[PDB]
């Protein structure tokens, strides 16, 4: 009943990488790769922007004078901003900028745990010399897909009319693929490998992720072990 | 008989749910049945679901 | 009698009248769901005869 | 990021050979992720004397 272990984890781009698992017995390459693809693509830690209170904006359907992106579209752009924290479960970033030109993700106020993996990510443009936009961007951390609709049940006096909610996008993973090639260790009958080619927005490192995946995996088998 | 009228404008944002009608330009209708997770989606060798 | 748009509505809590201004009309931009009062209105019916 | 665990597991015996076990609280997609990973190893790698 020989057990596996990890092996060379080859980073290619800041986005994706090919992790590999060398010691797989007969057919176990498939039994893992699909079971691992499942937990990789679905349940993972992520931090996505949630509550956004902007300068003069009452609701997501208006237009702020001096910016060519409709407020709705700017919220949507935020849903695609990738960031990462370390010790905070919610951090509120203060973004300020003015002047004609693109306002990217590097113009925000840096925090101890803030790492912007895509400083070039476009939030919106600015069409006039003096026009200023201040925004409180409340980013929290969680799991899965929480749409903006299911968030307005707690409510409990979210009276801040300017606090526009967006949909929780929480997930690092984009595309996960596994390929099992026959791995020949110098002495054994026939053994297999596991090539897991995954794809990410850069907010989680491969070894950390694939570990926590198997963690939850074995954690559900707990009850199963007895009855 | 009407002294005053107040008209309120609500903007609802609906996405998609089972029961909506969908069709291509070719006359093939359909009504979304289940919303399936990306995990259960048939995928190709590259790993991209459908 | 004439009908009033006034914000004084018999039998409603503070949570109900929150989203309305002094005049009885919901603020612009306030997100609402089922049951929320968009415009307060009250009509005379006298001598209830309980 | 706490992770929901199962509960209740009524084991209905069907004589002495086989049975139908059941697990109620499995989150999204985990029914397949477990059921399939267990089907695989049950049919293939198990101790036996044949």
């Amino acid at each position: 009943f020989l057990k596996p272990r990890l092996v060379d984890i080859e980073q290619v781009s800041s986005t994706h990488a090919k992790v590999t698992l060398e010691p797989l017995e007969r057919g176990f390459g498939h039994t893992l790769g699909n079971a691992l693809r499942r937990i990789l693509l679905s349940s993972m830690p992520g931090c996505a922007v949630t509550e956004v209170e902007i300068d003069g904006v009452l609701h997501e359907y208006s237009t702020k004078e001096g910016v060519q992106e409709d407020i709705l579209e700017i919220l949507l752009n935020l849903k695609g901003l990738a960031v990462r924290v370390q010790g905070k479960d919610e951090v509120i970033l203060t973004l300020n900028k003015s002047g004609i030109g693109p306002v990217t993700a590097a113009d925000i106020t840096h925090d101890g745990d803030v790492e912007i993996v895509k400083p070039q990510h476009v939030i919106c443009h600015l069409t006039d010399e003096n026009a200023s936009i201040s925004m409180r961007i409340k980013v929290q951390r969680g799991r899965g897909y929480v749409p903006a609709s299911t968030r307005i049940h707690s409510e409990e006096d979210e009276r801040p009319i300017g606090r526009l909610l967006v949909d929780a996008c929480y997930s690092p993973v984009e595309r996960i693929a596994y390929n099992v090639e026959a791995a020949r260790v110098e002495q054994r009958t026939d053994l297999d490998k596991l090539v897991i080619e995954m794809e990410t927005n850069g907010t989680i490192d491969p070894e950390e992720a694939i570990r926590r995946a198997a963690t939850i995996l074995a954690e559900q088998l707990e009850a199963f072990v007895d009855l | 008989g009407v002294l005053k009228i107040v008209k309120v404008y609500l903007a609802v944002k609906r996405r998609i749910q089972p029961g909506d009608k969908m069709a291509g330009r070719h006359g093939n209708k359909g009504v979304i049945s289940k919303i399936n997770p990306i995990e259960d989606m048939p995928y190709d060798e590259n790993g991209t679901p459908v | 009698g004439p009908e009033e748009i006034t914000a004084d509505i018999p039998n409603v809590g503070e949570a109900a009248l929150s989203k309305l201004d002094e005049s009885g009309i919901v603020y612009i931009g306030a997100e609402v769901t089922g049951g929320d009062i968009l415009v307060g209105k009250v009509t005379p019916k006298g001598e209830t005869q309980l | 990021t706490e992770f929901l665990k199962p509960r209740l597991v009524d084991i209905e015996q069907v004589s002495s050979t086989h049975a139908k076990v059941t697990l109620e609280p499995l989150e999204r997609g985990f029914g397949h992720t477990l059921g399939n990973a267990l089907r695989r190893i049950l049919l293939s790698s198990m101790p036996g004397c044949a």
Side-chain angles (χ1 to χ4, degrees), chain A residues 2-227, chain B, chain C, chain D:
Chain A
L2 37 142
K3 63 167 69 69
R5 207 195 178 282
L6 52 149
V7 71
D8 160 52
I9 320 166
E10 173 200 317
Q11 211 80 22
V12 40
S13 172
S14 168
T15 55
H16 86 105
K18 302 214 301 282
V19 325
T20 315
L21 285 76
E22 187 84 304
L24 291 175
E25 295 202 284
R26 175 186 323 282
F28 270 176
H30 286 294
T31 312
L32 277 182
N34 190 51
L36 287 185
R37 176 182 202 269
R38 172 68 48 81
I39 321 297
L40 276 182
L41 289 180
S42 71
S43 4
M44 281 290 300
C47 40
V49 47
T50 311
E51 307 178 16
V52 177
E53 184 168 17
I54 338 149
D55 210 42
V57 208
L58 284 304
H59 52 64
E60 36 188 321
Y61 302 97
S62 67
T63 56
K64 208 279 177 57
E65 176 59 64
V67 35
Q68 73 165 348
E69 268 80 356
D70 294 75
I71 302 301
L72 194 274
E73 191 192 352
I74 314 175
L75 284 190
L76 262 62
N77 276 302
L78 281 179
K79 190 180 303 176
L81 172 54
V83 78
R84 179 166 68 186
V85 296
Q86 292 166 18
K88 293 184 175 181
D89 279 7
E90 54 189 50
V91 58
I92 322 174
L93 287 72
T94 307
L95 183 274
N96 293 294
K97 190 66 181 302
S98 60
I100 297 182
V103 178
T104 58
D107 299 15
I108 336 181
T109 298
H110 188 270
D111 182 87
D113 292 335
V114 160
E115 178 184 350
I116 308 292
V117 76
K118 43 202 309 174
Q120 320 90 324
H121 180 65
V122 45
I123 269 57
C124 61
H125 300 189
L126 244 292
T127 183
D128 182 62
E129 291 197 341
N130 48 326
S132 177
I133 42 167
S134 71
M135 61 191 65
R136 264 182 299 279
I137 297 177
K138 204 274 302 171
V139 176
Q140 70 178 47
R141 207 156 59 137
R143 183 177 71 258
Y145 181 75
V146 175
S149 198
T150 48
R151 317 215 307 102
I152 181 186
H153 179 80
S154 69
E155 197 166 344
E156 280 202 326
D157 192 84
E158 65 171 60
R159 198 277 321 172
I161 48 188
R163 274 199 176 273
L164 283 332
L165 315 85
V166 312
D167 310 90
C169 196
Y170 317 139
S171 198
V173 295
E174 196 82 289
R175 162 204 316 181
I176 269 71
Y178 73 96
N179 327 291
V180 297
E181 54 172 322
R184 306 301 173 178
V185 70
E186 193 160 348
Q187 178 70 311
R188 186 69 176 103
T189 62
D190 58 332
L191 285 190
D192 312 285
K193 204 179 291 185
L194 187 48
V195 179
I196 305 173
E197 181 171 350
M198 68 175 64
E199 169 67 67
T200 309
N201 52 329
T203 55
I204 278 299
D205 321 282
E207 194 169 36
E208 160 136 327
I210 203 69
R211 170 182 311 278
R212 194 155 6 188
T215 303
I216 314 162
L217 205 166
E219 201 173 344
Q220 287 283 49
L221 279 173
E222 189 173 312
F224 262 155
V225 172
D226 358 329
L227 277 318
Chain B
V2 41
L3 307 170
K4 47 196 296 194
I5 299 182
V6 189
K7 296 180 177 180
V8 192
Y9 290 71
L10 268 60
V12 171
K13 203 161 58 184
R14 292 168 178 163
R15 302 178 213 82
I16 193 161
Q17 49 165 302
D20 285 348
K21 217 197 235 196
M22 272 180 291
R25 290 162 291 180
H26 296 285
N28 42 342
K29 292 122 103 61
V31 163
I32 165 70
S33 61
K34 189 206 194 66
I35 178 78
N36 242 349
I38 334 97
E39 313 133 51
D40 297 355
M41 281 295 96
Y43 58 96
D44 58 344
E45 57 180 20
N46 201 10
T48 52
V50 59
Chain C
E3 313 180 344
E4 305 179 29
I5 310 293
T6 188
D8 205 74
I9 312 177
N11 299 8
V12 279
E14 225 80 324
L17 297 180
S18 61
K19 325 194 68 172
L20 300 171
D21 69 333
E22 329 162 55
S23 207
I25 288 86
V26 60
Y27 302 95
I28 291 177
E31 296 167 346
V32 279
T33 116
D36 286 314
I37 295 90
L38 293 177
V39 172
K41 193 174 81 76
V42 281
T43 82
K45 179 67 251 299
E47 60 111 60
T48 50
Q49 170 67 6
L50 42 65
Chain D
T1 163
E2 348 298 313
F3 230 97
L4 189 142
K5 240 167 193 180
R7 295 194 286 198
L8 52 149
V9 71
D10 160 44
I11 321 166
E12 173 200 317
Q13 211 80 23
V14 190
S15 172
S16 168
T17 55
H18 85 105
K20 303 163 72 175
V21 203
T22 314
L23 201 75
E24 186 83 304
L26 290 175
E27 295 202 284
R28 176 86 64 83
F30 270 54
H32 286 294
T33 312
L34 278 181
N36 189 51
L38 286 45
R39 176 183 122 269
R40 172 67 49 81
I41 321 190
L42 276 182
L43 289 180
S44 295
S45 4
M46 210 52 177
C49 320

